[PDB]
Amino acid sequence: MTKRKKISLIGSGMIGGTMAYLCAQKELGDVVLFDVVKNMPQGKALDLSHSSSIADTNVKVTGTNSYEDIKGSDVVIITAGLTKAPGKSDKEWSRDDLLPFNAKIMREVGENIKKYCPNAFVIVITNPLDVMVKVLHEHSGLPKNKVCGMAGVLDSSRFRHFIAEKLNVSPRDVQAMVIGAHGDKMVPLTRYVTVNGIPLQEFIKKGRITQEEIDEIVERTKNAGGEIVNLLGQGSAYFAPAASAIEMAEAYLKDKKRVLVCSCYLEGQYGHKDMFVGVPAVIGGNGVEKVIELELTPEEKELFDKSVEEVRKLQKAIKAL
Amino acid sequence: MTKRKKISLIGSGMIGGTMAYLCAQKELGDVVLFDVVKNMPQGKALDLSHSSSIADTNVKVTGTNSYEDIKGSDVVIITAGLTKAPGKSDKEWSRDDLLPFNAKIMREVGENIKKYCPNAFVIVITNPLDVMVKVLHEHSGLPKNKVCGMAGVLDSSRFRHFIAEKLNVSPRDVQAMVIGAHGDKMVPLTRYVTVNGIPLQEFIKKGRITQEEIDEIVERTKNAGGEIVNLLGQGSAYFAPAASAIEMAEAYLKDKKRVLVCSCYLEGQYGHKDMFVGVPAVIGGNGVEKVIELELTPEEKELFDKSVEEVRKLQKAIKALGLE
Amino acid sequence: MTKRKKISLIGSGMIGGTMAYLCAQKELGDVVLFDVVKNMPQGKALDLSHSSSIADTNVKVTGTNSYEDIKGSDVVIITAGLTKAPGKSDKEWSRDDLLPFNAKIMREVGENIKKYCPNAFVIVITNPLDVMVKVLHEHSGLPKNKVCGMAGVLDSSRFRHFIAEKLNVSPRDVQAMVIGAHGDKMVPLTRYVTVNGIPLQEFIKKGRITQEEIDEIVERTKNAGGEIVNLLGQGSAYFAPAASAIEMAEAYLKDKKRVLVCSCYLEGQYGHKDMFVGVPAVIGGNGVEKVIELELTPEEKELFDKSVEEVRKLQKAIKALGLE
Amino acid sequence: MTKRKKISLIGSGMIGGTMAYLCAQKELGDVVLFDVVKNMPQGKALDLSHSSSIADTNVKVTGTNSYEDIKGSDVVIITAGLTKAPGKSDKEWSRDDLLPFNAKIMREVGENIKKYCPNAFVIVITNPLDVMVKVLHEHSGLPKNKVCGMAGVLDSSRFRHFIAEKLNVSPRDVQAMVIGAHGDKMVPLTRYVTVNGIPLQEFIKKGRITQEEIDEIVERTKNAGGEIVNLLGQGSAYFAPAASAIEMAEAYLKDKKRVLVCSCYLEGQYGHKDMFVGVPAVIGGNGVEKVIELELTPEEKELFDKSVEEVRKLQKAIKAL
Ligand SMILES: NC(=O)C1=CN([C@@H]2O[C@H](COP(=O)(O)OP(=O)(O)OC[C@H]3O[C@@H](n4cnc5c(N)ncnc54)[C@H](O)[C@@H]3O)[C@@H](O)[C@H]2O)C=CC1
Ligand SMILES: NC(=O)C1=CN([C@@H]2O[C@H](COP(=O)(O)OP(=O)(O)OC[C@H]3O[C@@H](n4cnc5c(N)ncnc54)[C@H](O)[C@@H]3O)[C@@H](O)[C@H]2O)C=CC1
Ligand SMILES: NC(=O)C1=CN([C@@H]2O[C@H](COP(=O)(O)OP(=O)(O)OC[C@H]3O[C@@H](n4cnc5c(N)ncnc54)[C@H](O)[C@@H]3O)[C@@H](O)[C@H]2O)C=CC1
Ligand SMILES: NC(=O)C1=CN([C@@H]2O[C@H](COP(=O)(O)OP(=O)(O)OC[C@H]3O[C@@H](n4cnc5c(N)ncnc54)[C@H](O)[C@@H]3O)[C@@H](O)[C@H]2O)C=CC1
Ligand code: NA
Ligand code: NA
Ligand code: NA
Ligand code: NA
Ligand code: NA
Ligand code: NA
Ligand code: NA
Ligand code: NA
Ligand code: NA
Ligand code: NA
Ligand code: NA
Ligand code: NA
Ligand code: NA
Ligand code: NA
Ligand code: NA
Ligand code: NA
């Protein structure tokens, strides 16, 4: 027979469990929840299985502590890692501090994907995102087009939300992109913001939003992750990160050809190669099918190149490991 | 006790039945299917009721030949009318030719709305769309913001589909608008076409699509209704018209603040007033909450003005029929 | 690279188009609409393509007059045929009368499936259903588990709807089955009717529904097809037939293991073999994975045997046409 | 205008946040997340708002520490309270130990519902469920039909899941009910289990499942809450509890007339009155529209009456407060 799709979630914490719930609600495929912690993914899997009955969907949800159970996965989504570095306060939280803790985890996961599901489409979530995806790609041996990082969909969702809220319109009808590194130097593309294709500038000219308000939204987008960390007190965002990754997974599973900003392997686009960084891309059944090369202005391109330089700096730290 | 929403579909032919099906699938509210043909809406309503059981939804679907059954409707969607004018060939099909048959229907429907459900949001579909919505509005007494015509969502869906197909991307990520009259002088706004906010021009510059291909798509969008009429042999398009109108209805029922191109009553925007014509609008729980005035170029403005002039010419026929 | 599922709809009339619409709304897979009428499926496919843009789904819909386009289909759903026999009145409508027109179509469709998509799961809808599925199976060469007919899901949806309406409860929470032939001798299984597993008898005992009312509903379920034919004036039911078949298709495509009454090839269950007839079955990625043999009472068993005998009598006509 | 539905979630912990996510995914209505903890519901609300943009839905999600913000709610769902008593181990976890901690919370919530949204349909989740709903009802002054507890949908979902898993069929097609108290004396109704109306007994006779396996499933259903507690290590189930409560809320909001097992105010049915206990009911726009009185056998009725006696014992402890 043609089996149900199989989705393995490597990491069964807040984002992993939430993604599993979306899979159950949407009947996307059977789900494997893997974690190094004993019993916990098994507990969540039972709870999730009961929820599938409530939803009238048909999904097996298995919890496991064994990598062998990811065999034959169509999609693998990786959240394995730490959310907040040990001896730091909330206000000084930085994704950069997670690097030493999480890089070795990406090596281990990569080696197991190589062994058990080398044909999977792999979405990396673990921070610091752009270099974690690079470590995963290197150690997994997967094709460049079959690995990417989730960040841009989340950052863009934030930009969209804030603009849509200010304009008081449906976020379906706001198009907004944030490109570059998933960090303080991410680049919200104000010039490309549209309302059903209508340039945001028209709304400025009509006084429906001011440049000052847009500037504030741009900074709020950059700081959104830390804003939520400060408010939650424990851990970081998970509802939107989970939804973002599942949007990418759906695009793959049903060959949708979505245009989504993801951390993608560059091969000369934007003047850069051999790193992952946030760029608009077409996502379908062949993974990252196309990186779209925006006609950035020199000012936007300078911001992007500065963003890439932050990834290069992090990559030096990876090399040092 | 808060009742289910009530949606009346005045006209139970191809578009009306198909809209009722979407209401059943989406569990939007209870449905009244009204038609002048005896028994037919009753039969469709039974079939649709059975389909709601299959969908595991909770919807009453009532077929009727009595206007009284529209009482208390939250939304009314009007498709009553002819699709093709008697004695005309398919090749010479024109929405204009439907005017003398369908205008009188709009007057009658308006009179009934005025007494039975004057607080409804009303979406007109019947052709020729922009003048039919005006007749309905005038004879119903409804506020300007509570009546509009479905056309732009359909015309835009076509423009979007053709662009998305050529670029091989999801239509979710193509934004395209067609404004003006729902007819041969509709205005597909090439300058405003975007792929997730990326200007279509960027794709031209990279040779992903040519200007010639875009020109062809613009014409194909204008001709799409007639294309389908010619292929089908019977009637006209209904799957996408139905979905378009239901998208508008959902925006109202759940106060979504969607930005949708609809035929709206103008009060000076674009330099025009007192007609309905296709413009981007924000649709929510107050109906047409805002008409958006695009910063059109002189060239686009001239295309729009010529489109409005086609509506004015049809309005002369409305006046001549004694229906103002 | 794993391709989208491919669903071919052989027949692009009322049921075929409506199924394509559900496929577009639900994003089930790419759709091929095949028909013998030139241009019509092409026109519907355009309309449906536009509707997919509105739905924000990602579906290719292809209209065609060539069987070659069914190559590689995961699922085929067959509605090709007549709905009403020439020269007969609506009041005397009988599915039986469609047999000599539709049997030859099943043979032709089978021959094409045999060469172009022999690994498809095939759902037959064309009437008279139980013998049409047998002709298709025989001439297609497919395994017994990979062909079935849609009828029981529709007949059960009707029984469910009528019971739920009388009890004023959600049809999601009414379980009702109709087994046997898809015709006047179908068997609505009153003893098996439940409300979330609660026997219908409990509602009788409390006077929520009477035996007389249940008897009326049983007859109404049997007569439902003809009731809709009489009301509509043109054709027959399509909204619920379409939804029924798509429910079956989904069970296959996502290996759901649904318990659905379908016309299935019997191999001794109920003491019968080598015909298709309506029985509860488990539907999943291996097609008809299991026929469930109900513990029928002697009285129920006699009703079922009489239903099977109606199928046997129609099969005599199939043989006489030279179509075995 | 006719405004969007408004759903207030009193308690913004695991179940509250999860319910909010379902509201956002399903576009059910605007959501207010209330908690006594500062900042946390505001953080979750931001995360959830970003997720609504991803989902292309149109939902306002507000976090608050002020009861005034529940004004005009169509539905209120209450999870405010403790999940596990302080000085007890996981294996000895009991919903009964939560009584002293959670009863006063129900009084406070009730008084605020009375003040700010007396016309709401109110679903109580806080344990010990059947007596917590009684305290809420008493102090809120709401009509008997406008308050109920979520338990039976969850317990029944578990029974359904386990049976469906054993039979290898879709849980949509298994009907199963658990009635009585939401506790160790809940009553899984084996005799009423059906597969699309087909009695489970037919499957026994055919050897597709044994009586021993059914007996094991009945006990597993009773112990399912504690099974998940033991596996998770922190807190209790939330994915299925959240989905169960939202199923009940949907039935109200769209007047669906669902037949759902809920903890309902009895007025003589089953020989009992003036308490809440788990019974099948019709849920629609008038709340609990009808309690369905099953034709229980004497043996089933004895189990039910014993279940009710457990509620009466808990009610004595409530009285003592
Ligand atoms: N835009 C983005 O890319 C975002 C990324 N993140 C990142 O996602 C990651 C996960 O976040 P949450 O799920 O909230 O964290 P969490 O702490 O709730 O879950 C992480 C899980 O990873 C597990 N884990 C640790 N080592 C492992 C190994 N070797 N193999 C398998 N599992 C292992 C832990 O046991 C834990 O259950 C973090 O690194 C976080 O910074 C979070 C939000 C957005
Ligand atoms: N974008 C747009 O605005 C579009 C508009 N249309 C128009 O929509 C209308 C309906 O199209 P279909 O549903 O395909 O046509 P249809 O012919 O299938 O159905 C029209 C129905 O109107 C009924 N009718 C006639 N007079 C009536 C009265 N006084 N009261 C109630 N019902 C009455 C009929 O008996 C018939 O059932 C046509 O005028 C067509 O041109 C169609 C496609 C797109
Ligand atoms: N429960 C059931 O099993 C039900 C079965 N039916 C049956 O389904 C069938 C279709 O019904 P509708 O879609 O409403 O009819 P319809 O008349 O709208 O469409 C039938 C289509 O079949 C086509 N056709 C004829 N010969 C063909 C060939 N050799 N190849 C391809 N296409 C061909 C037509 O040109 C027409 O478009 C009828 O036989 C009807 O009795 C209808 C309702 C329920
Ligand atoms: N079938 C059922 O009825 C089930 C019931 N439960 C019960 O649901 C309740 C909540 O469970 P979770 O959400 O997992 O717990 P949680 O600990 O994650 O969340 C409880 C929230 O209530 C808040 N809270 C405490 N006092 C409050 C007050 N006076 N006003 C407003 N908020 C207040 C806390 O700050 C906390 O955020 C528990 O009592 C648990 O036993 C859990 C699972 C199933
Ligand atoms: Na791969
Ligand atoms: Na209509
Ligand atoms: Na119509
Ligand atoms: Na429109
Ligand atoms: Na327009
Ligand atoms: Na058009
Ligand atoms: Na047309
Ligand atoms: Na057109
Ligand atoms: Na078909
Ligand atoms: Na058809
Ligand atoms: Na069937
Ligand atoms: Na049957
Ligand atoms: Na029937
Ligand atoms: Na029929
Ligand atoms: Na019938
Ligand atoms: Na109330």
Numbering used by the authors:
A (entry chain B), D (entry chain B): 5 to 325
B (entry chain A), C (entry chain A): 5 to 328
Text taken from the publication that reported this structure:
LDH and MDH are homologous, 2-ketoacid oxidoreductases that share both a protein fold and a common catalytic mechanism. Both enzymes are found in central metabolism: MDH catalyzes the interconversion of oxaloacetate and malate in the citric acid cycle, and LDH converts pyruvate to lactate in the final step of anaerobic glycolysis. Following a gene duplication event roughly 700–900 Mya, one copy of this MDH evolved a novel substrate specificity to become a highly specific lactate dehydrogenase (LDH) that is now essential to the life cycle of many modern apicomplexans.
In order to understand the structural changes during evolution that shifted the enzymatic substrate specificity of the apicomplexan dehydrogenases, we determined the high-resolution crystal structures of three ancestral proteins bracketing the key duplication event: AncMDH2, AncLDH*, and AncMDH2-INS. In the following, therefore, the descriptions of the models are primarily based on enzymes crystallized with oxamate inhibitor or lactate, which are highly similar. AncMDH2* is a strict MDH, and AncLDH* is a strict LDH. The first shell active site residues are identical in the AncLDH* and modern Toxoplasma LDHs, comprising the same residues as the apicomplexan MDH active site with the sole exception of position 102, which is replaced by Trp107f in the LDHs. In both the ancestral and modern LDH structures, Trp107f and Arg109 are the only residues from the specificity loop that interact with the substrate. As in the modern LDH structures, ancestral Lys102 does not interact with the substrate but points away from the active site into solution.
